[PDB]
Design a protein around this motif. Sequence first.
Motif, PDB file in Angstrom:
ATOM      1  N   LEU A 153       0.810  -1.213   0.000  1.00 56.99           N
ATOM      2  CA  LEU A 153       0.000   0.000   0.000  1.00 56.99           C
ATOM      3  C   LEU A 153       0.850   1.273   0.000  1.00 56.99           C
ATOM      4  O   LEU A 153       0.388   2.342  -0.393  1.00 56.99           O
ATOM      5  N   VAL A 154       2.081   1.170   0.491  1.00 54.91           N
ATOM      6  CA  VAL A 154       3.082   2.228   0.464  1.00 54.91           C
ATOM      7  C   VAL A 154       3.757   2.244  -0.904  1.00 54.91           C
ATOM      8  O   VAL A 154       3.837   3.272  -1.556  1.00 54.91           O
ATOM      9  N   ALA A 204       2.541   1.227  -3.555  1.00 54.35           N
ATOM     10  CA  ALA A 204       1.440   1.775  -4.337  1.00 54.35           C
ATOM     11  C   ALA A 204       1.484   3.305  -4.459  1.00 54.35           C
ATOM     12  O   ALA A 204       1.056   3.850  -5.472  1.00 54.35           O
ATOM     13  N   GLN A 205       1.954   4.005  -3.426  1.00 48.94           N
ATOM     14  CA  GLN A 205       2.067   5.465  -3.410  1.00 48.94           C
ATOM     15  C   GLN A 205       3.472   5.916  -3.820  1.00 48.94           C
ATOM     16  O   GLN A 205       3.618   6.949  -4.466  1.00 48.94           O
ATOM     17  N   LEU A 206       4.499   5.140  -3.471  1.00 50.47           N
ATOM     18  CA  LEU A 206       5.888   5.453  -3.766  1.00 50.47           C
ATOM     19  C   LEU A 206       6.214   5.297  -5.248  1.00 50.47           C
ATOM     20  O   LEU A 206       6.670   6.237  -5.892  1.00 50.47           O
ATOM     21  N   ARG A 259       4.601   2.737  -7.997  1.00 45.88           N
ATOM     22  CA  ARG A 259       3.727   1.771  -8.675  1.00 45.88           C
ATOM     23  C   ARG A 259       3.868   1.816 -10.200  1.00 45.88           C
ATOM     24  O   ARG A 259       2.963   1.409 -10.927  1.00 45.88           O
TER      25      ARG A 259
END
Length: 29
Positions: A19-20, A22-24, A26
């Motif tokens: 989920l991190v 995904a933001q960092l 992806r």
Amino acid sequence: TGHRMAWDMMMNWSPTAALVVAQLLRIPQ
């Protein structure tokens, strides 16, 4: 919706970093 690899994509098990990620990062950069 989705199905078709949901089983190892959409399932929120414990994607603690994912989920991190995904933001960092992806994307291939």
